[PDB]
Design a protein around this nucleic acid. Structure first.
Lengths: 113, 79, 178
RNA sequence: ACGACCAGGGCUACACACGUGCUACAAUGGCGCAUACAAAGAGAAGCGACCUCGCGAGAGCAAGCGGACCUCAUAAAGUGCGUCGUAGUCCGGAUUGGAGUCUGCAACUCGACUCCAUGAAGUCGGAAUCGCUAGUAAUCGUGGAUCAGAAUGCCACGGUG
RNA sequence: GGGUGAUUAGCUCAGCUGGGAGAGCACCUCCCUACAAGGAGGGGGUCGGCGGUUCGAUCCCGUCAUCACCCACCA
RNA sequence: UCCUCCUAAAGAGUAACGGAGGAGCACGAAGGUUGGCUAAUCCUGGUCGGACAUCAGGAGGUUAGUGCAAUGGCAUAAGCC
């Protein structure tokens, strides 16, 4: 467990093994392999055969975790006190692309009793 | 989302933008349109927007260009 | 080992140019680094402390020993010197041994940061660096990440003011900025 | 005047649940590649071929057709190889950031289309409930209307059965 | 004036060698059909206030606030 | 019944239903010892996070502790190891 990053899956497909850890997109998770000659097939579970111990800096040399969060939060850097639409909708946990709040809202605040 | 290389401002506003630094003497531009955007060429001008109840002055700086008057006189409240 | 050798030649031995002394022996020195790792949700049994200290001793050069409590901690049944955590305090060569592993090889869990402040204060010049976890060192196989465990760091020095300790802050490669 | 001319709002605002439509939780599966067997209909500021460009949406050169002409448009399930094998999964993508496309006097709010990067739920379902008697129930494909620009709702026709 | 005992889910109340809270009945949402009823699913605690003993106190100790009850006791 | 201060007179006992509070059991350890060791409280600063909360540095000092209420020795520690 926790061999590709912060996420717990034991046995995972190699072309998406760097997903769900805040540092790699779906196509990048396959492109990062072919720049190093790494295999694009068969699921991985350990640090064998150079299949992922070769990818530690190639992920970290870009925006990752809080640095990625800060970059996708550039949208509101002029709205960190000014509430105009996106401002207030980020200063509290709120929708920014429309929400039909009278249904389909559990996911915004917490699960039903 | 495609707006580039020049501001989308009407000719009735261009008659004002040429003489906008007189806004220590001249009173705010009374506007009813809210779909309208703020641009760098407009900096120095004073503007007042109808909030659907009254006209209110809106404070403009070069930091907030590319936003709409409906973001300062808010559309369908909501919080 | 190179960073303690840099401390023996490149740090404060010319400080008389900037700070007033009656002897060149007054220039500031590092005394200790105390450290801390918190037992968290295991406090009511804490027989795992021997097994948690053994993995702090996997990046530290010291032999593990267990922190005794002070003034008790909450209502968790803590009495007198009850074993409650780990410090495994660093002195001498062991201080810079650790600061040649910290953010040199132990890296895969660091947070977004680029430089800690130099103009920070306490009244003596005793600096701190926020890390929250033991941030993991890479092995040939791991199979080592489940919870990683905590880390806290504040140095102790012979300095008498925050700007005198700012000259002793030169003793490390950790990102600090003026 | 509550008019309707004009610049503009709201009718896609949620203190909470259900109905409708729908997809996954799959292995009697899904994806890519190949390939068998279609009906029906719409189509002159339309459908737009070949060909070019644009990761693509779309744009350009430009044939024919006004009806059995030429175009939308090689129908998809089905079959065959590979591959997954309880893994909160190649699955599934709410949330969401950027960059392009398109209509329009104007699209952020309350539009569509495309390409990236980021990513939660879903491992099975309570008291209960519904539809068909045969090419029917099952279940995947394909059109039509409205219309500057945009339907998953409405109507309509095939495949296996 | 003197005294006994309590204060925890809306209400009834559990939980004292001193170990970070639980049931019944309501209620709330849903199912059945429209409420009564029947069924199913779900919920959150100023566990009186301030001091003292203690590692830890609603829980042991003091003292005030409150309630219900007892009582105003010889000639 | 035992046990403690003040009142209680610079020898000494000491009244009051005077001012005020406890014990009625524990501890193989806190017992024996050679050696080694040295707070409280207030303040500054905290972390993924707090109903409670880390280890340092600054002030300070027979102000912590001693199985238990109460007082006083106490580092030669009689305090803990």
């Amino acid at each position: 467990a926790r061999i590709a990053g912060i996420n717990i899956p034991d046995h995972k497909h190699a072309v998406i093994a760097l997903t769900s850890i805040y540092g790699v997109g779906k196509t990048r998770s396959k492109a990062i392999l072919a720049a190093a000659g790494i295999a694009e097939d068969v699921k991985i579970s350990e640090l064998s055969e150079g299949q992922i111990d070769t990818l530690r800096d190639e992920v970290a040399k870009f925006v990752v975790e809080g640095d990625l969060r800060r970059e996708i939060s550039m949208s509101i850097k002029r709205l960190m006190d000014l509430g105009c639409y996106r401002g207030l909708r980020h200063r509290r946990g709120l929708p920014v692309r429309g929400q039909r709040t009278k249904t389909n809202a559990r996911t915004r605040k917490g699960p039903r009793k | 989302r495609s707006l580039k290389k020049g501001p989308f401002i009407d000719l009735h506003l261009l008659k004002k933008v040429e003489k906008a630094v007189e806004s220590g003497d001249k009173k705010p531009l009374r506007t009813w349109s809210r779909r309208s955007t703020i641009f760098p060429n407009m900096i120095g001008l004073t503007i007042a927007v109808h909030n659907g109840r009254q006209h209110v002055p809106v404070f403009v700086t070069d930091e907030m260009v590319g936003h709409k008057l409906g973001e300062f006189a808010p559309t369908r409240t909501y919080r | 080992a190179k960073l303690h050798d840099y401390y023996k030649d490149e740090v404060v031995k010319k400080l008389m140019t900037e700070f007033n002394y009656n002897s060149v022996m007054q220039v500031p020195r590092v005394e200790k680094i105390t450290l801390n790792m918190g037992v968290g949700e295991a406090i009511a049994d804490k027989k795992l402390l021997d097994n948690a200290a053994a993995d702090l001793a996997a990046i530290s050069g010291q032999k593990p020993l267990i922190t005794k409590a002070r003034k008790s901690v909450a209502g968790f049944k803590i009495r007198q010197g009850y074993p409650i955590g780990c410090k495994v305090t660093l002195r001498g060569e062991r201080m810079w041994e650790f600061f040649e592993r910290l953010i040199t090889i132990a890296v895969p869990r660091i947070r977004d940061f680029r430089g800690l402040s130099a103009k920070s204060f306490d009244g003596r010049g005793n600096y701190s660096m926020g890390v929250r976890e033991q941030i993991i060192f890479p092995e040939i196989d791991y199979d080592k990440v489940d919870r990683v465990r905590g880390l806290d760091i504040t140095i102790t020095t012979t300095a008498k003011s925050d700007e005198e300790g700012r000259a002793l802050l030169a003793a490390f490669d950790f990102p600090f900025r003026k």
